[PDB]
Amino acid sequence: AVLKIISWNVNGLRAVHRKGFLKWFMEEKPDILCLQEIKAAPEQLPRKLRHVEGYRSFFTPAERKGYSGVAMYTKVPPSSLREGFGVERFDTEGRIQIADFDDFLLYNIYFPNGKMSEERLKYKLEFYDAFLEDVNRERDSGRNVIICGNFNTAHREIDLARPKENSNVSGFLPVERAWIDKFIENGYVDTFRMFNSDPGQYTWWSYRTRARERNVGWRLDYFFVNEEFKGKVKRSWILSDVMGSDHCPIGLEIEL
DNA sequence: CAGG
DNA sequence: CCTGGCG
């Protein structure tokens, strides 16, 4: 029994609903759908998005309206859902869903963007620190974990079309890049790179200069698992053809 | 406008 | 570029 999970930074769920989100959702038929950057509290949503056929839905909006926020739809409900790491400033931004299924915890995370200021870059970095602490504590206790979402960082030079020009841009800073290295050596696998070693694999493209039609992008969106669980991951792929956002969806198939 |  | 309070 393959379990299919999809992660998609929709950048406005209302927007993506106007562009055929539900029709796509319906034909893709994942067991779990994780969304990031919803930009909506549930009360602001068309009610068709709040009552989807065959799915439990959970929304974790930001305190600031039309900003950030994450969501999850799941055929099988989780036994619990956490919306924070237990640190106020990281828990108030609609950035975290940690859902408990029997066999694993699923982290659906919208990691912060650091481009706006030094203050937000710090925030990004410390959020990473709080995140790593949290996941380590969980897998240390013997839990197997799946982590998807917008990390807002391209790991290596191969993970973006233009590495050289972005050395001094948040998204490809040596400090952000080293954190992913750190995160990985803590015992986690970048599951896409388990199966695909090719360049040109991106999940985000600038709307400006129409970067997507030339594949001038970044791989900002990932599925990670803890090392002990990697033998369960069957497929890890990018849904490059799917439109409606400046990010595309990514997929994971595990079999338990 | 702010955020990305 | 695209999304999401004016007044």
From Swiss-Prot:
GO BP terms in the entry: base-excision repair
Lineage: Archaea, Methanobacteriati, Methanobacteriota, Methanomada group, Methanobacteria
Cofactor binding notes: Can also use Mn(2+), Co(2+) and Ni(2+).
Gene Ontology MF annotations: class I DNA-(apurinic or apyrimidinic site) endonuclease activity; DNA binding; double-stranded DNA 3'-5' DNA exonuclease activity; endonuclease activity; metal ion binding; phosphoric diester hydrolase activity
UniProt source species: Methanothermobacter thermautotrophicus (strain ATCC 29096 / DSM 1053 / JCM 10044 / NBRC 100330 / Delta H) (Methanobacterium thermoautotrophicum)
Name of the protein this chain belongs to: DNA uridine endonuclease
Family: Belongs to the DNA repair enzymes AP/exoA family.
Entry annotation: catalytic residues: N150 (proton donor/acceptor)
Annotated EC: 4.2.99.18, 3.1.11.2
Keyword entries, A-Z: DNA damage, DNA repair, DNA-binding, Hydrolase, Lyase, Magnesium, Metal-binding
Disruption phenotype: Depletion leads to the loss of DNA-U repair.
Cofactor section: Mg(2+)
Note: The insertion of the side chain of Arg-208 into the DNA helical base stack seems to be crucial for the uridine recognition.
Protein residues bound to Mg(2+) 1: N11, E37
PROSITE patterns referenced in this protein's UniProt entry, alphabetically: AP_NUCLEASE_F1_1, AP_NUCLEASE_F1_4
Function per UniProt: Involved in DNA uracil repair. Recognizes DNA uracil residues within double-stranded DNA and initiates DNA-U repair by endonucleotic incision on the 5'-side of the 2'-d-uridine residue, irrespective of the nature of the opposing nucleotide. In addition, acts as an apurinic/apyrimidinic (AP) endonuclease hydrolyzing the DNA phosphodiester backbone immediately at the 5'-side of AP sites, and as a 3'-5' exonuclease. Strongly binds to double-stranded DNA.
Reaction catalyzed: 2'-deoxyribonucleotide-(2'-deoxyribose 5'-phosphate)-2'-deoxyribonucleotide-DNA = a 3'-end 2'-deoxyribonucleotide-(2,3-dehydro-2,3-deoxyribose 5'-phosphate)-DNA + a 5'-end 5'-phospho-2'-deoxyribonucleoside-DNA + H(+); Exonucleolytic cleavage in the 3'- to 5'-direction to yield nucleoside 5'-phosphates
UniProt binding sites for Mg(2+) 2: N150, N152, H247
Gene3D superfamilies membership: Endonuclease/exonuclease/phosphatase
InterPro entries: AP_endonuc_1, AP_endonuclease_F1_BS, Endo/exonu/phosph_ase_sf, Endo/exonuclease/phosphatase
